[PDB]
């Protein structure tokens, strides 16, 4: 087949990730229409409709039946390179693909880094306050 970390580049792989996706037949954001946009289902307790671009890792919840996944993806992550790939997958050159896989790798780095930043800023806030409340007496 194809390798594990490169699966999500396959639409049928992405579709397959939608299990208990509420929006079906009559809806605009079906699993199929979602996978075509690059999303995979990654639900939680408090966010069961949660979905994510496999390429830019943008996360969207609060879907509605008439949501066009491609339109929603463009609005929220206009910079997403996958949005620009007009070719069919198997029509890509290995160079084109490897070039893309590296942008994803970077995209992944950024999100994680940006996360670690938020976490750290939050901690820096707590610590600062503790110190403030100490000098308030």
């Amino acid at each position: 087949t194809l390798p594990p970390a490169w699966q999500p580049f396959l639409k049928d792989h992405r579709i397959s990730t939608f299990k208990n996706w509420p929006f079906l037949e009559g809806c605009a954001c079906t699993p199929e229409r979602m996978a075509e946009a690059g999303f995979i289902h990654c639900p939680t307790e408090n966010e069961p409709d949660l979905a994510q671009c496999f390429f830019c890792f943008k996360e969207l919840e609060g879907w509605e039946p008439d949501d066009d996944p491609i339109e929603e993806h463009k609005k929220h992550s206009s910079g997403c390179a996958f949005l620009s790939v007009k070719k069919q997958f198997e029509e890509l050159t290995l160079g084109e693909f490897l070039k893309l896989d590296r942008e994803r790798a970077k995209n992944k780095i950024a999100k994680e880094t940006n996360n670690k930043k938020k976490e750290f800023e939050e901690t820096a806030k707590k610590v600062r306050r503790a110190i403030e409340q100490l000098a308030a007496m």
């Binding site: 966010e47 949660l50 943008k58 996360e59 969207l60 919840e61 609060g62 879907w63 509605e64 949501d67 929603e72 929220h76």
Partner: peptide, 4 residues
């Protein structure tokens, strides 16, 4: 849809 909106952002997490």
């Amino acid at each position: 849809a909106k952002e997490r």
